Structures are given as structure tokens and as C-alpha cells.
Amino acid sequence: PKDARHDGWQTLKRFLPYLWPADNAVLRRRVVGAILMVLLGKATTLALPFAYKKAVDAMTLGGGAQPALTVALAFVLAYALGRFSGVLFDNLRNIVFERVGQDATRHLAENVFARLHKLSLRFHLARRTGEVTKVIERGTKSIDTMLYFLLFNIAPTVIELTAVIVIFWLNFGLGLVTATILAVIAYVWTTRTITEWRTHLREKMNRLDGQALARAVDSLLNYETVKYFGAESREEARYASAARAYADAAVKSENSLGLLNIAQALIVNLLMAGAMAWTVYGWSQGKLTVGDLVFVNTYLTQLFRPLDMLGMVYRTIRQGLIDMAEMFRLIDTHIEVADVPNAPALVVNRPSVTFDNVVFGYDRDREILHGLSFEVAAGSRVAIVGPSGAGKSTIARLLFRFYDPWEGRILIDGQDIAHVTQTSLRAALGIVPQDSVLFNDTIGYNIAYGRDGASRAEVDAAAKGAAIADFIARLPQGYDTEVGERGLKLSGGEKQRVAIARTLVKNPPILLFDEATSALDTRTEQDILSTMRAVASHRTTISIAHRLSTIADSDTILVLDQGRLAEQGSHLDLLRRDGLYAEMWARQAAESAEVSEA
Amino acid sequence: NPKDARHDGWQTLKRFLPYLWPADNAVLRRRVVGAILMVLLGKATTLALPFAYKKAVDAMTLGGGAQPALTVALAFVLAYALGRFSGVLFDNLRNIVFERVGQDATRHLAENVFARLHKLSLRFHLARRTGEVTKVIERGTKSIDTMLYFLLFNIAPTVIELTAVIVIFWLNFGLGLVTATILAVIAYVWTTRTITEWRTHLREKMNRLDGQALARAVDSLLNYETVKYFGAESREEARYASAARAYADAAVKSENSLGLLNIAQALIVNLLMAGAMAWTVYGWSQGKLTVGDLVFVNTYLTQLFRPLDMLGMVYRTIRQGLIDMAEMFRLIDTHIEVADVPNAPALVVNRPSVTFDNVVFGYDRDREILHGLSFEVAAGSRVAIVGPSGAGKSTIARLLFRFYDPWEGRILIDGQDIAHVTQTSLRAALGIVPQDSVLFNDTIGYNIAYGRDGASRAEVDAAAKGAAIADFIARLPQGYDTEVGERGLKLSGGEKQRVAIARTLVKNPPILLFDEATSALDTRTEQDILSTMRAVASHRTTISIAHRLSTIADSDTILVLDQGRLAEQGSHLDLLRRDGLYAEMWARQAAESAEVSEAA
Ligand SMILES: CCCCCCCCCCCC[N+](C)(C)[O-]
Ligand SMILES: CCCCCCCCCCCC[N+](C)(C)[O-]
Ligand SMILES: CCCCCCCCCCCC[N+](C)(C)[O-]
Numbered sequence A: 001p002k003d004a005r006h007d008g009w010q011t012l013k014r015f016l017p018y019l020w021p022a023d024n025a026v027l028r029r030r031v032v033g034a035i036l037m038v039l040l041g042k043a044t045t046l047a048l049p050f051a052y053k054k055a056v057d058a059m060t061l062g063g064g065a066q067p068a069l070t071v072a073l074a075f076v077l078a079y080a081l082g083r084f085s086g087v088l089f090d091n092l093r094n095i096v097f098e099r100v101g102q103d104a105t106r107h108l109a110e111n112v113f114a115r116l117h118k119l120s121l122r123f124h125l126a127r128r129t130g131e132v133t134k135v136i137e138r139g140t141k142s143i144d145t146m147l148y149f150l151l152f153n154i155a156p157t158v159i160e161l162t163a164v165i166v167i168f169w170l171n172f173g174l175g176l177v178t179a180t181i182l183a184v185i186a187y188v189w190t191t192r193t194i195t196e197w198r199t200h201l202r203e204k205m206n207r208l209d210g211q212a213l214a215r216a217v218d219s220l221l222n223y224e225t226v227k228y229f230g231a232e233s234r235e236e237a238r239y240a241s242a243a244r245a246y247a248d249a250a251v252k253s254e255n256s257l258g259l260l261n262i263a264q265a266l267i268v269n270l271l272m273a274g275a276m277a278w279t280v281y282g283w284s285q286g287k288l289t290v291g292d293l294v295f296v297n298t299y300l301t302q303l304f305r306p307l308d309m310l311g312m313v314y315r316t317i318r319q320g321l322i323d324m325a326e327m328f329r330l331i332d333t334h335i336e337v338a339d340v341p342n343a344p345a346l347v348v349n350r351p352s353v354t355f356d357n358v359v360f361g362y363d364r365d366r367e368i369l370h371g372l373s374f375e376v377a378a379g380s381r382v383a384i385v386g387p388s389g390a391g392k393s394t395i396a397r398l399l400f401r402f403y404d405p406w407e408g409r410i411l412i413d414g415q416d417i418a419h420v421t422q423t424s425l426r427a428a429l430g431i432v433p434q435d436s437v438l439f440n441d442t443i444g445y446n447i448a449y450g451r452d453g454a455s456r457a458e459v460d461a462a463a464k465g466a467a468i469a470d471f472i473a474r475l476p477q478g479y480d481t482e483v484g485e486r487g488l489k490l491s492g493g494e495k496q497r498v499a500i501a502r503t504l505v506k507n508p509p510i511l512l513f514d515e516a517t518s519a520l521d522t523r524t525e526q527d528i529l530s531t532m533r534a535v536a537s538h539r540t541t542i543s544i545a546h547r548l549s550t551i552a553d554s555d556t557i558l559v560l561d562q563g564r565l566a567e568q569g570s571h572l573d574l575l576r577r578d579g580l581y582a583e584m585w586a587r588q589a590a591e592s593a594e595v596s597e598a
Numbered sequence B: 001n002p003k004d005a006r007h008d009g010w011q012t013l014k015r016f017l018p019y020l021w022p023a024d025n026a027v028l029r030r031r032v033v034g035a036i037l038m039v040l041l042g043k044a045t046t047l048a049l050p051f052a053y054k055k056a057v058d059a060m061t062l063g064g065g066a067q068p069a070l071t072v073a074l075a076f077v078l079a080y081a082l083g084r085f086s087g088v089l090f091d092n093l094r095n096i097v098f099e100r101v102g103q104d105a106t107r108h109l110a111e112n113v114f115a116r117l118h119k120l121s122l123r124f125h126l127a128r129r130t131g132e133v134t135k136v137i138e139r140g141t142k143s144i145d146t147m148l149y150f151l152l153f154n155i156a157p158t159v160i161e162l163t164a165v166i167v168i169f170w171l172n173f174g175l176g177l178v179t180a181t182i183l184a185v186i187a188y189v190w191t192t193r194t195i196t197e198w199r200t201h202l203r204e205k206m207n208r209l210d211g212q213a214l215a216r217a218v219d220s221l222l223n224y225e226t227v228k229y230f231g232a233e234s235r236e237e238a239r240y241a242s243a244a245r246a247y248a249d250a251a252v253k254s255e256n257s258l259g260l261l262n263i264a265q266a267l268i269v270n271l272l273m274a275g276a277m278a279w280t281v282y283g284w285s286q287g288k289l290t291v292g293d294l295v296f297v298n299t300y301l302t303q304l305f306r307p308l309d310m311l312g313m314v315y316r317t318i319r320q321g322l323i324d325m326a327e328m329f330r331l332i333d334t335h336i337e338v339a340d341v342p343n344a345p346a347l348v349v350n351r352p353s354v355t356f357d358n359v360v361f362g363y364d365r366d367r368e369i370l371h372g373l374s375f376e377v378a379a380g381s382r383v384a385i386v387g388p389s390g391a392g393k394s395t396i397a398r399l400l401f402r403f404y405d406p407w408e409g410r411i412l413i414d415g416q417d418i419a420h421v422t423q424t425s426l427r428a429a430l431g432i433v434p435q436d437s438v439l440f441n442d443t444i445g446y447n448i449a450y451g452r453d454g455a456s457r458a459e460v461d462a463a464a465k466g467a468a469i470a471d472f473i474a475r476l477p478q479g480y481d482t483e484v485g486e487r488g489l490k491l492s493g494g495e496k497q498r499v500a501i502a503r504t505l506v507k508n509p510p511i512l513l514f515d516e517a518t519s520a521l522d523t524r525t526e527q528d529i530l531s532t533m534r535a536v537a538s539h540r541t542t543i544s545i546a547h548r549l550s551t552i553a554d555s556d557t558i559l560v561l562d563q564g565r566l567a568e569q570g571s572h573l574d575l576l577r578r579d580g581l582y583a584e585m586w587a588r589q590a591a592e593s594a595e596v597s598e599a600a
């Protein structure tokens, strides 16, 4: 299986089950029909030059003005009809297949998509919409072009080349056979080596093009700054030099194409010259008819027509195979966090949260949690705070099982979250993160996202609960207002309110505020804090906060130092202890005063 | 006037022709001539080579005058092969010789448009998304290049060949044959075109669906965390699958239609083939035509219809290329709102005063903002401009840099109306630190050096020091070669403002503008940067446009705008004493800060 040379062959064999699904009968029928269309089309194209030979033969055999007229007429008509017919077969093959190709590549994409969702968070799925989109577009085009070239250019040509070898064998040579085989070998090898050089030139040209283009775009998007420094002439010169570098590279790449074409023309035409000369010489001895010259000429031109594209085909087939290989590598990549076999669902009857001696870090060379233990009582409002090395920023990620502890365990109710299904676990958890994100869709879609079947009544109830309902009411399209971009832009407080609403639709027993107000301004922070307190009403709530004043009303506060629980208690008890929390409090207070000073 | 014509493809091409035939470069003109010669040689060769084929056949079937027939046939066969290779050689030599011409012409068109875009008014608001613009321009470049190549090296050679084939078929056959092939070409073109319009529409629908599917997938992947938080994986998968199926259906239709065009083309071509070959053989029956003639006619027809095998795509591309090119010329045509007057003198700043003289202005003609604004800023003085929401102060810097002209009134620097001087000299007199400074996609050292064209490493260092950003750059791994902006290291607002101060330091302008310079900063950052700003304001005329009055209270004088006019003028104390608009504002701002101080 995967235990193989890892070449184009393996990638292709891996793709083969998509083309021959074994789920779908209809597609299998289509593949068969397409193959029949290939065989018919080749049969037709091989046959039609014989029709040409006969017409010539009848006019040359050949004592004057004879029934040769009827026969020659019949044969030219057969030849023309054959030409049209082969085209009909080829286009019919394309048509019958296209559904197969489209389905197979779709299923491959869907499999990759699903896996990418199963894979680890640590794969840094935070990047540019444009860059990713360009890459995926490029690869999609790559794999498609590749499939079409492989199935409908290379394979028919292998069949035709073999048939021409058998035919040329039976009726000529075998000097003819060796000459054409050597010609094909030289043609392929030459095309290949020149193509490798050409692909390198293409890459350089492409990179230069990107550079000139980046210069123009950066310049234009910075029109104000360019005016401010009166730098138009400068930017023009800057663009122009880049544009010149690009043009030089383009001239080189395009010229190298002329070289490949000429090289190919020489090979084909030496073969033409030799084959036709030899055919004439055979005719001179009465061994071969005059029709034979036409026969050989047609056979060779037909053979070498698909190889006219060979260079491009090769580059393309190469690139696609690379890209597919890449696809499969992702499908192959192992999943860091998995449900154990036959994992039970989490059942939350009492929503306590326990951290039991948790040792964790993102990377094995940097340990963040050094044996963290704490208990959060069901229904309590708790805060987790600490200074810079405390490790509090891991809590949410550990709790939703984005990662597993190196050592120790996390429990909800009485249960190790490592031993339950990931879906049931996340089903018990609500989060309002620091930067909530909106999908590119309506406010309603975004709120409804909290639970799969969510009704509009539910969206309304949640929107009320987060107090974003009036704002939505004052939009013309209300809940059908598109947001994100290109959509309406929301303020930070508005987005946090959507996030809270989303969680309200989910309606979880355990709710996490993960630096929820950290990006908000003061007035916004104070406003959203009452909504948060209200929404915390009959849930176990864990608030992870930088600014202590925002969490002072907590039932209890857990203070972390150096990956362990340093202090615990209510805000007054902690101030009374004169410990780490008290110090932080003083410090934050002092800074608040300082800003007020100025 | 060439611009005085119907707006079609012909006009667009005629506009492009001077780029192809420069009358500046000459070398390129030679290349164009040479390329045309390669077209002619290549055509002569391809038209000639079937005759060599015809003759070879003739020597084999009427070997009476052509002997030794083996020798005659061989010589002709070799002639034919040599001819094939030769036509290919001419064609590629033509491409090679032209390619520099093409690249240069399109480069110049691009440079003309670029220069224009910089000349056009700010109101076209040229700040938008990099990815979209880049993909569009890439699309347009590919589009125009492809149409040029198809026009010069597919359509035109085919016209030459088609005419030649008509003259030849005329002299030596038919002329029923001439009519038949011409009818065939006409049917072929018409069928191809009508099918192509339909196909192009299907292509557009397909493409739009593809983008939609890709966007759903990308939104999901970039939102892996949120998708996780809500257990929404299956939902997102189904959501991708639905779009993906819509795309696949559209693609299937589009590719199927390709099969229809190909089949229609083959029907037309092959009917012609059948008729021509029948007519030729029957002509042979009557002793009119040689058997070589059959081969000759067949070869001629296949050669004629090979470049037309691409006709559909070709048609789609050339059309699009022409549209895109027209768009280019439209930009070049668009008139310039703000221009130097003819033979404009340089602005000469000896004493750097600034005068606003009865200035009436608005961005748009139905909304007037400045209603006759007048003020004098003394050379070397430090002044602030403040006002409430409708005062119009946000226009001042834009008027000074002549992004726009006053509707009425004028602006003077050192007694010279800025409308009548060269824009470059005027802008040379002015420094600005704007509210949001922007960085080029390049190193931080480049961004600082940008203040003056020839800026030395030393000047950059001095400016960085004056901006108090030198220490920060030192602690960068790559120092001045640290890449910044998008695709680069992210700088804080204060860091960006400090880079802007450094650029202005490199520039060393006589007059300096702080245009809401600290308005995007937090309080401490603002307080830090203000001392730097004051130091750099030392011996310049400085104009500070500020929302927050406390940040400008130490000004030599303060200009208070209300409703597009000068309401109040004077020192911060004179203004508090008057108990006027500035006083009210001051009081209110103080109140607000205290209220904010309250929440702690
Ligand atoms: C309809 C075609 C769907 C198949 C999936 C296409 C995704 C292409 C991504 C290829 C990128 C691989 N890589 C990283 C080497 O570029
Ligand atoms: C939105 C209007 C587009 C006009 C922009 C033209 C600026 C010149 C950039 C052309 C780039 C040429 N290229 C891609 C070959 O480098
Ligand atoms: C071959 C290089 C010539 C400059 C390339 C400029 C690209 C032009 C893109 C124009 C597209 C505008 N549009 C879609 C409205 O037609």
C-alpha cells in the first residue's frame, strides 16, 4: 500500500479508487463507456488512413479511367466520415468522463477537508485568505489539468503508438518500426530535458512578475504617503526597473519555448523524411503501393500530433502529481488528539471542573504548567488570574482538549475528558474568547451557529440575553444583515455580544470567559461585564482575566504562579493575605492612577 | 483625433499601435519588420510544401516525364520534409524576434497607466484590498498578452493563408472549390462564434461557483478554533460539499459544451473535406487533374483549418483582451483634477509663513465645509488648530498638500499661492505626521530613508535617533534591514508614528504638520511621543491639528474653528479667559477625562 517507492505511480494508484468508487455504480458505467469511446476513437483514427491509401491505390491501379472513380469516391468519403467520427468519439469520451473526473476530485477534496478538521490546532490554521486561496486555486487547476492530460492525452497516445508499432511491423520494415521507435525516444527525451530547463526559467519569470506587481500595488495603496513625500517619480522608476527585470525573464522563457519547438520539429521531420524516402524506395521496387506513402505520412502525423503538446503536458503532469502527493500526505498525517476506542459520551449532571496535577506545554522543550491542581465547584463563579509566567492562557485550550496534558488529567463531573468523546466534551463547554470571529454570513447565521438546529426564536432569545437585540432590530435587514466582509463591520463590543449570544444558543453547563474583555475599551468593558454576570447565572463560570478589578466580585479566585496554584480565595481574603494577588492588585491600581495623572 | 471615434476593438488596437511601432526605439521597429518577414517566409514555405508533396506523387504515377522517377520522388519527399521543418523554424524565429517588442509595448502601456494613477485625484480613494487588486491585474496581464499573441500570430497569418489558398484554388481548380471553402470558413466562423458566446457565459457561472466553494472552505479552515468550539465540523463539511457539488455541476455543463463546439467544427470541416476530395478525384477522372492534386488539396485544407481549431478560445481571449485594454486607455484618458499651471514656478520658501485667504472648500459640490476660512500662521511659530465636529479642520492638511483645490479663496506659503507653483516644490516644503501612518512593504530602514530620495545611512541614523526609535531598531535582529508592514514585523502605533517622525526628520521641511498625530495612541504613548514631537518642532513652523486640547495647550497660539470659519484666536490662557468656545471645549474634555478616571 503506502509501503512503496513514493513516486507518481503510488500517488496515482492511491487516486484510482476515486475513479472506480465501488460505491457508485453509475460512475463505474461511465468509466467503462469512456474507455469504449477511447477504443472506438483509436480504431477509427487508425482505420481512416487505410481509407486514404485505397483511394490513392485505386487511382494508381490504375490502367486509365476505370471503375476506379467509384472506388476512389467511396474511399475518400469513408476517410472524411472517419475523420468526423473519431472527433465525435473523442468528444463523447470527454463528455462521458467529465462527471467521473469532477466527482472523484470532489471526493478527494472533501476527504482532505474532513481530515484538516480532525488534525491538530498546532498546525497554525491562521493565515491569509488571499494566499491560501491562490494556493488552493493553483493546486486545483494543477490536479485537474494533470488528470485530463494523463487520461486523455498520454494513455490514448500509448495505445496509438503501440498500434502503429504492430501495424508498421506487419506491413513494412522493420527498419520503419525501429526508425519510428527511435524517433519517439529521442523526441521524448529531448522534450523532457529542455522542459526541465524551461520550467526553471518559468519559475524565475513568475517570481519577477510577482515582484513588479507587488511594487505597483504597494505604491498605489500608499498613494497618500507617496504624495506626502512627492515621490511619484521615485515610485515610477522603482516600478519600471522591476518591470524590466520581469520583461527580460519573460523574453528568455518564451525564447526557450522556440528552442523546444524547433528541436521537436527536427526530430519529427528527420523521421518523416526517412520514412517517406524509404517508402518511395520500396515502391520503386514494386514492394509497396503509392498509397503506402500517404499511409505512412498520415500515420506519422497523427502519431505526433498529441506529442506536439508534450513539454507542457510533462510540466503539468509533474506538478499535479506533486500537488496530489501533498494532498495525500495531509490525509496521512496523524492526529494528535483522539477519542479512545469505544469512548463513552460525557454526561454532565454536576458541572464541576477539576485540574489534577496537570503538567503541560505546547512544545516539549518549554513546560508551562508544572503540576497544576484546582477544584471548581459546580455553579460557582470563579476567576483564574496570575502574572506573566502563570500559564493561565493554557486553561481554555486544555479544557476543550485542543491538547492533552503531558502528565495529569482534567475532569468534568467525575470524568477524565481524555477518555470521553471529543464531541460530548465540547458539547458541555461555552467559551467567549478574546477576539471572537464572525463568519462571512448573516448575524443570524453567526448566532445560530451555537447549536446545529437553532430556530429563530432561539436566536432571538439569545440575542436578548446578550443584549445585542436592539442593535439588530435597528438594522434594516435585522438578523439577515450580512456581517464579516464584504459585510457590515461590527464594533468590538458588538462582536463580543454576538459571541455571548452564540454561547447562549448553545446553552452549556460550563462557561469560560477567556480574556473576554481584554480588547475592549473601558466603557465597553464595564457595559459587557453586567451582561456577562447575568449570562453566568446558572452555569459554572471560569473567567480568565488580566485586569483584576474586572473579576473582584467572583465567588473565588485562583491565583497561578509558575504553572502552579499559588493562592486561592475571595477578593477580600486575598487582599488580607498580603500575598501575590494583593501585590498585583496594588500594582494595577497604581498604574490606573498613573494613566489618570496624565 | 483618434479618440474621436466609435469605442470598439479597432480603436483600442489603433491606440496600441504606437507602442508596437514606437518611432522612439528603432531597434524594436527593425524587430517588427523582421518578424513580419518571418511571417511571410513561413507562409511561403507552408504553401510551397504541399506542392512538393503533389509533385512526389505525380512522379510516381506519371513517371513518363519525371525520371528516374525514384530520384524525382525522393527529391520531392525530402523537399516536403525540409519544408515542414522550415515553416516551424520561421514561426518560432518570428516569436523570438517579436517577443521583446511585445514585452516592451505592454510594459510601456503599464508604466503610462501607473504614472496616471499617481496623477489622479485622491477621491478615487485608492486604498482597498491587495489580494483582489493583484489577482485582477494578474488576470488582466495574462488577458492582454494572450490577445496580442493570438491577434498577431494566429488571426493575421490565417488571413494571409486564407487569401493565398483562395487565389491558388482559384488559379488551379474550381472555382466551385473556391466558393466551397469560403462558404465553409464562413459557416465555421459563424458557428464557432455563436457557440462561444454561450460557452463563455457557462464558463462565468462555473467560475463564480468555484470561488464560492473555495471561500466556504477557506473561511472554515481559517476558523478551525470556532468550528471546534461549537462542534460544527460535520456542518462545515456539508456546507463545503453543497457548494462543491454546485461547482461540479456547472463544470460538467461547461466542459460538455466544449464537446458540442468541437463536434460542430468537425462536421463543417469534414463535409468540406468530403466534397473537395470527391471533386478532385472526379477531376482526375477527366484527365484534368493529377493524383498528386488529391494529396495537394487535402494538405491545403488541413493546413488551413489547423489554426481555426483554436478559434473559440482565441475568440474568447481576444475579446477579453480588448476589453481589458480599453479599460487601460480609459484610465489614461481620465482628466487630472489637480495640475500644475503651465510653466509653473517653484515655490520659494525664505520665511515659512502660512496664509489661508478666504478659503471656500468641500470634498463634494453639494456639501461645503469651509465657508470662507481665513488665518495667518507666523513663520517659526507653533500653532494649533482645534474645533468641534463641523469646524472643518480635517481638511487643512489635505488643502496644504494640495490634494484638492479651494473652490474659492487661496492658500499661500511665504506669500505665494500654492495653486500656482509646482506641486513637487510645494510638497517639498511640508512635513506631515498623520493619524495613521502607513509603512511600505519593505525594511524599516527603507521606510525611514523614504523622507528624502538620496538619503544616506547616516541621515537615517540621525533621524531614527531624533525620533527616539534608534534603540528599538538596534534591538531588532536584522536592524535597519528588518522587513516591516504587511508581510513583515508588526509595529505598535507609537512605533509607526516614530518612524513617521523619522521620515520627516530625513526630509527636514521648513513647515511641519501634526495631523491628529497622537489621536490613535493610548495615553502613555501619547505623552511619550509628545516630547519627541516638541523637540522636532524646534525651529520650524509647526501646525498641530488636534482633537484633545490638553495635547496642544502650550502652543504659541491656538486657532479655534467653528462651522468652517475662524471663531477664536489666542493663547490657551487668553482663550480660557474669554469663556468662549475653546473654554467650553476645554471644560468638557476635562470633565470627560475625570469621568474616565472615576472608573478605577
Ligand atoms: C476539484 C479538485 C479538488 C482537489 C483538491 C485540490 C487542492 C489543491 C491544493 C494543492 C497544493 C499542494 N501544494 C502545497 C504542493 O501546493
Ligand atoms: C485597477 C486598474 C489596474 C491598473 C494597474 C496598472 C499598473 C501596472 C501594473 C502592471 C503589472 C504588469 N506585470 C503584471 C506584468 O507586472
Ligand atoms: C500585459 C500587461 C498590460 C498591463 C496589464 C494591466 C491589467 C489590466 C486589468 C484590467 C481589468 C479591468 N476590467 C476588468 C474592468 O476590465
Ligand SMILES: CCCCCCCCCCCC[N+](C)(C)[O-]
Binding pocket: A109, A110, A112, A113, A136, A140, B210, B213, B214, B217, B244, B247
Ligand atoms: C495547506 C493547503 C491544503 C488545503 C486543501 C483544502 C481543500 C479544500 C477544497 C477546495 C477546493 C476548491 N474547488 C475544488 C471548489 O475549487
